[PDB]
Amino acid sequence: IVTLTRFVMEEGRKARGTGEMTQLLNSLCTAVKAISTAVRKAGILHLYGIAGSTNVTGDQVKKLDVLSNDLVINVLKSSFATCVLVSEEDKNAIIVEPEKRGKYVVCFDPLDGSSNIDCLVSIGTIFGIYRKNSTDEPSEKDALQPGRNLVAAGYALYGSATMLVLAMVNGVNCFMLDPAIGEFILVDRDVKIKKKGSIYSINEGYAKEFDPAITEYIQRKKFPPDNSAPYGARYVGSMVADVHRTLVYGGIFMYPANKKSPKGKLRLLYECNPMAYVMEKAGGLATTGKEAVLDIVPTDIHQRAPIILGSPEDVTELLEIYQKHA
Amino acid sequence: IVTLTRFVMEEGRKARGTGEMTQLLNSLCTAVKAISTAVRKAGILHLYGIAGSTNVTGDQVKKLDVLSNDLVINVLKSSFATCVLVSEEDKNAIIVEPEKRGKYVVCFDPLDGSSNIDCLVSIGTIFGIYRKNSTDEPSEKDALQPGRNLVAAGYALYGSATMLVLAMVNGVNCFMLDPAIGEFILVDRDVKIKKKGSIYSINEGYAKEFDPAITEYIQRKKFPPDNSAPYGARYVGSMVADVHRTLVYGGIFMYPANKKSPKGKLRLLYECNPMAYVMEKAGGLATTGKEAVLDIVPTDIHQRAPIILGSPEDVTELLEIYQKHA
Amino acid sequence: IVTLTRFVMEEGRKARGTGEMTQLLNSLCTAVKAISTAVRKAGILHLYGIAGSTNVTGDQVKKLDVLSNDLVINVLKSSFATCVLVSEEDKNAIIVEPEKRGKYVVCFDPLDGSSNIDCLVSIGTIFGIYRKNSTDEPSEKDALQPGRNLVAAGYALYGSATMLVLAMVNGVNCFMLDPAIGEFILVDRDVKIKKKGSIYSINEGYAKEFDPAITEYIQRKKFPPDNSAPYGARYVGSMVADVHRTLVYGGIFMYPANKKSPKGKLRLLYECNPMAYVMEKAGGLATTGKEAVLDIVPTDIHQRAPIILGSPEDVTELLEIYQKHA
Amino acid sequence: IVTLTRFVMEEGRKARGTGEMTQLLNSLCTAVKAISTAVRKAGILHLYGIAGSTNVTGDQVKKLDVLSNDLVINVLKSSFATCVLVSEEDKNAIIVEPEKRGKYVVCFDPLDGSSNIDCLVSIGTIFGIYRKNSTDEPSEKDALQPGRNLVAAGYALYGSATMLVLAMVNGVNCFMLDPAIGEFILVDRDVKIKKKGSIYSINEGYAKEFDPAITEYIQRKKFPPDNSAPYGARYVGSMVADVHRTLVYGGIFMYPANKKSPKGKLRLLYECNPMAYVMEKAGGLATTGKEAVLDIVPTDIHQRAPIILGSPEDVTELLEIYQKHA
Numbered sequence A, B, C, D: 001i002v003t004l005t006r007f008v009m010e011e012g013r014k015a016r017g018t019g020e021m022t023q024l025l026n027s028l029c030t031a032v033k034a035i036s037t038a039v040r041k042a043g044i045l046h047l048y049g050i051a052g053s054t055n056v057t058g059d060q061v062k063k064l065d066v067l068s069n070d071l072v073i074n075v076l077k078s079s080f081a082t083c084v085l086v087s088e089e090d091k092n093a094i095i096v097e098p099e100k101r102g103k104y105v106v107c108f109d110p111l112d113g114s115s116n117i118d119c120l121v122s123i124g125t126i127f128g129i130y131r132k133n134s135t136d137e138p139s140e141k142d143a144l145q146p147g148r149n150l151v152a153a154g155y156a157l158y159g160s161a162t163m164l165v166l167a168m169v170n171g172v173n174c175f176m177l178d179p180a181i182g183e184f185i186l187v188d189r190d191v192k193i194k195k196k197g198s199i200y201s202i203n204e205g206y207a208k209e210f211d212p213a214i215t216e217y218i219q220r221k222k223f224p225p226d227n228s229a230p231y232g233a234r235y236v237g238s239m240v241a242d243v244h245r246t247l248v249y250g251g252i253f254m255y256p257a258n259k260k261s262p263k264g265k266l267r268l269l270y271e272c273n274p275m276a277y278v279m280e281k282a283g284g285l286a287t288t289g290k291e292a293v294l295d296i297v298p299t300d301i302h303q304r305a306p307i308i309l310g311s312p313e314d315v316t317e318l319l320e321i322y323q324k325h326a
């Protein structure tokens, strides 16, 4: 009954804004439908495989990585809503040409879940949007803001259905892509996560690298001291799918620092911050183990951060173990 | 270039068959496209939620469970290829009315991955097909054959794209649904699994219930005795998605017996056997820990079995630990 | 490469407008995709047949008439771009509720070609858009402006492909709906009609009712005095399809006054004016036989007018015959 | 509820056939969906325009002509149901390679309505199917049978929706393509044309070339001697669209001989015969003016014939005028 565009317009209708945000999200939706279309038949389009280079954080580049990067960059330029673009796929920020320049900075991972592409598991797109603040010429530094400054963030999940989850100041809403008329339609309004869940999600292949707090925490999930039933384990291996399930079912998702990676793996600007902002707008928590993800001031557009997120009593329980081992 | 129908006809073209198998798979494809269509927009169709009963193995029944069960049963009847139908959703086998009766028995899970429906993770449909052997009137007993007797088995995966994986006597092929013309198109021919992989997939929330062989096996994945890199962990929580990844990337998927479930959870007829047959046709192995899944003679259409499957050196390694603890 | 939204924004980008027009056309596109979707499978949705009433001009109301009317009205309200709506399906103008009120008046035929629905011939949607001028409370009178005041007009054609043809002050462009990603994509830029064509389009079943100018004109098409080849006849029987072909191939389309209908059949506000404006922006002409369609000041939202349109040398030839018989 | 495949199988189920016909129509449906898909977005695929040659009857070849010809030929080969193929696009019959040879001869117009492609009016595909009779090696002569020998004929109409109309010995049924699941679904069962209609359909641009019977007949449609209301005129200019409307609304469609074309324009094998067979199975009539289309023994695969078809009292009325002028 309500499309994403309708919803957002009937909203900024309040914020009394200039409709730029609305253009920005309209454009992104177009990118997102196009990626979704290609993804649901990638093998028929021969879109599996590498594109033959390595990106800034050292990921081998897949064909969908390239295709989805070009779609997002292009639609964002043509929106007239943006001035600085940070993409996981590009070493440096992309400044938008003056004539198409708009007020927003957008950090995004055009296709998240690379390792899961060829086995047809859920993958997604992640974005976070900042208002340019400085009056300087637009530059890479306009992307170096803490997540606490986000005006909007969320992700497209190409899962069993394609969902656009969009968090802004007042709350989180889910919009499902109807493939027939190619519109995103509101299906979940003002989403809130459960206070406590019963699923934990981490790659246990890193057991030998985990610090003692994560180690103790996982052990308590398997052998609860109060004799409750042990938590269920889930780890899809695509951040967007695992975080989405954490949102709608509750529980906790972890990609902590470990002995080989003092700052974890996941990227602060375009993986960790958008998901922490979604989680916080749903009443959840997102921490590194020692500080709120959203309060970290980045110094590098490609910097990494540990992230633990989801239901606040689950995350709090893990915080108390870190504090304990501090 | 090659659709599933073309492929199968150009095949039985050899087996010199009566084209019944081809009708059977044509019909199933129609069910599968219809379920795929509903699934990619389930929330817009209001198809999330329970249907308000409990099935034979004790699963709470979801709306998609019902919809997908009715589609599969209906298309299979109308195929003229079948005589006995076993569905996870129905307490008893369904005998097909004489006028539509054909020679095949079909065991199927019309929608697998229930727990993952509402969080939009991959779900699927699983099927295995037997030739009726007895000359008796068709009855439930015609479904009580070991998996070694399968003539065809496989599954539809509603993941990032919709894939139909179809194993028959000569090998395994993957066909991707092209949503545009609504045909399944051949994308992977004569699939073979790697001899050894580097991903393990099990719900570790059951740690406290695992027997000593599974326990030792998981510990070796995390701390390899030969100092290699530890295996990666993946557990999507839908059998079809986890098995599919095991197929195309190699490694091992486990749902073993445990202290509460001497026969594991997954159902022999319509979960374990179709996947073991796929795996064996790809050169992989599928065991309970003590015997080949495909050799078990069922006594109950809803009976459970432990299953460990995937790359033969991974499964063999786990067999040797069981033997050791025997 | 260029969607309708992109195109229109990169345009008003010039007119330096408030983006209201852009919202208006975005919304309309959503209506249009939805109608297109229903239309391409109307029989499967049981959408053929009457809805069981008679409209203001006396048309028996079809199911698609109702469905398409509700979609257009709804999306136009929710656009915040409109204040007065005139629809062929509603006796009176619909005033938009203050909170959703915008500056534009929109006259539209939500589904044109009724007689052709059940035989699956091309049908369409027609619209014309006026700026509210008065400062009075919005009322029916704001729709009573001559076509010369249009700021935008055009039509969606549900033909072999779905095309959105959009005329504004600077020219006419065609955008084709890509069903896959559900976006309208620019396919024909700055369309101009040929100066002279070689197809005439009129219902000759009305021969006995035609005035002497139309009669002489048709006879000259069949027996050209200069011995050229006779014009080809085409009459699809849906105004949108016949006018569209007149646009892209040139020639003339006629629905003149006749002995039973001094003002023809087609409705001035939402059939004749939008098509005359398109034609004039393409360099064509649109007349009643005695005056320019676009200069008629309506007194009735449902009033009829004769219309002759297309290539200027064809229309001019017919004007000269009227003048001759004057 | 009933797909084309289901319907046809539940039919030959009676004729007790070998399922070859069913394979043949399955294959054709796949061609037809593929052409439909391309057609609904032809401009986005750049598929408008000529392919740069002239075909046997002298038509300039369009891109869709080529694409649709290759799809039909390919799917028909791979069906194992055919041995000789006649296409409007190929000078000579195509003999199928022994290994894929089946018992049927198929004459088809892979894309009918060329002149209407670029203006997005309805176009279609026409087919007629004969059993090979001789025991000779298959050759062009196996296509030279009268239409009275057809076992099946009909057409796909790419109009406002895509319809497959299929006539066989017992009657005519319509199946609508559901774009969502890509199946043709039964929407009109055992179609019969009205005995008398009230629409005439002919290109009147040929007035100066019509014989006296056609001339008198058209004049009576415009000035009925019994004072009834004059017939409505319709002429879409694509045979498939005009014939389809004649079927579902009744009336008459004419492409007669004229002074320049003693045998009319339309091709006997793959335009006239399939449509005459459909019409006769619906209780209608199809004549040249002097003999039944279906009884003409062709001598040339590309030969032309006059055709007048539709409601039997309309066609009969025109027959009586020919007899009168004989």
Ligand SMILES: Nc1ncnc2c1ncn2[C@@H]1O[C@H](COP(=O)(O)O)[C@@H](O)[C@H]1O
Binding pocket: A008, A009, A010, A011, A012, A013, A015, A016, A017, A018, A019, A020, A021, A022, A131, A151, A168
């Ligand atoms: N459609 C909208 N929904 C919610 N907030 C909006 C919207 N548009 C603008 N805003 C907020 O108000 C400010 C001005 O918005 P705008 O100028 O319309 O991009 C932005 O920084 C947003 O934080």
Ligand SMILES: Nc1ncnc2c1ncn2[C@@H]1O[C@H](COP(=O)(O)O)[C@@H](O)[C@H]1O
Binding pocket: B008, B009, B010, B011, B012, B013, B015, B016, B017, B018, B019, B020, B021, B022, B131, B151, B168
């Ligand atoms: N299309 C096919 N592809 C592969 N094997 C087939 C096919 N059709 C039949 N068979 C095999 O040959 C036997 C006869 O097949 P049918 O009678 O055509 O169902 C069956 O039991 C199958 O095991």
Ligand SMILES: Nc1ncnc2c1ncn2[C@@H]1O[C@H](COP(=O)(O)O)[C@@H](O)[C@H]1O
Binding pocket: C008, C009, C010, C011, C012, C013, C015, C016, C017, C018, C019, C020, C021, C022, C131, C151, C168
């Ligand atoms: N996207 C656009 N393309 C072309 N003209 C526009 C556009 N937006 C506005 N205009 C024109 O400029 C005026 C202000 O437009 P707006 O206020 O944006 O609706 C309108 O009356 C239009 O005639």
Ligand SMILES: Nc1ncnc2c1ncn2[C@@H]1O[C@H](COP(=O)(O)O)[C@@H](O)[C@H]1O
Binding pocket: D008, D009, D010, D011, D012, D013, D015, D016, D017, D018, D019, D020, D021, D022, D131, D151, D168
């Ligand atoms: N599915 C069917 N529906 C109607 N008639 C059929 C069908 N299959 C076969 N026939 C008729 O019976 C004969 C044998 O059909 P078949 O051998 O199945 O192609 C053909 O020449 C057809 O005229």
Ligand SMILES: O=P(O)(O)OC[C@H]1O[C@](O)(CO)[C@@H](O)[C@@H]1O
Binding pocket: A112, A113, A114, A115, A203, A237, A238, A239, A240, A255, A265, B232
């Ligand atoms: O294989 P790992 O080390 O568990 O990493 C998986 C993670 O990496 C990512 O693919 C991004 O690199 C995430 O989507 C996911 O959460």
Ligand SMILES: O=P(O)(O)OC[C@H]1O[C@](O)(CO)[C@@H](O)[C@@H]1O
Binding pocket: A232, B112, B113, B114, B115, B203, B237, B238, B239, B240, B255, B265
């Ligand atoms: O939550 P658990 O106990 O790990 O069970 C998950 C398994 O159950 C199933 O949903 C079937 O019941 C499988 O698809 C999946 O492999």
Ligand SMILES: O=P(O)(O)OC[C@H]1O[C@](O)(CO)[C@@H](O)[C@@H]1O
Binding pocket: C112, C113, C114, C115, C203, C237, C238, C239, C240, C255, C265, D232
């Ligand atoms: O049947 P007639 O009198 O030729 O009218 C056909 C005309 O009527 C309309 O359906 C609108 O009423 C137009 O789309 C078309 O041009």
Ligand SMILES: O=P(O)(O)OC[C@H]1O[C@](O)(CO)[C@@H](O)[C@@H]1O
Binding pocket: C232, D112, D113, D114, D115, D203, D237, D238, D239, D240, D255, D265
């Ligand atoms: O332009 P004409 O001479 O009326 O011919 C139109 C006819 O030609 C065809 O395009 C086939 O050549 C038919 O589809 C249609 O009935």
Ligand SMILES: [Mn+2]
Binding pocket: A059, A088, A114
């Ligand atoms: Mn990456």
Ligand SMILES: [Mn+2]
Binding pocket: A109, A111, A112, A113, A114, A239, A271
């Ligand atoms: Mn990522």
Ligand SMILES: [Mn+2]
Binding pocket: A088, A109, A110, A111, A112, A113, A114
């Ligand atoms: Mn990425």
Ligand SMILES: [Mn+2]
Binding pocket: B059, B088, B114
């Ligand atoms: Mn279940």
Ligand SMILES: [Mn+2]
Binding pocket: B109, B111, B112, B113, B114, B239, B271
């Ligand atoms: Mn299951």
Ligand SMILES: [Mn+2]
Binding pocket: B088, B109, B110, B111, B112, B113, B114
């Ligand atoms: Mn199930």
Ligand SMILES: [Mn+2]
Binding pocket: C059, C088, C114
């Ligand atoms: Mn009407």
Ligand SMILES: [Mn+2]
Binding pocket: C109, C111, C112, C113, C114, C239, C271
């Ligand atoms: Mn109309």
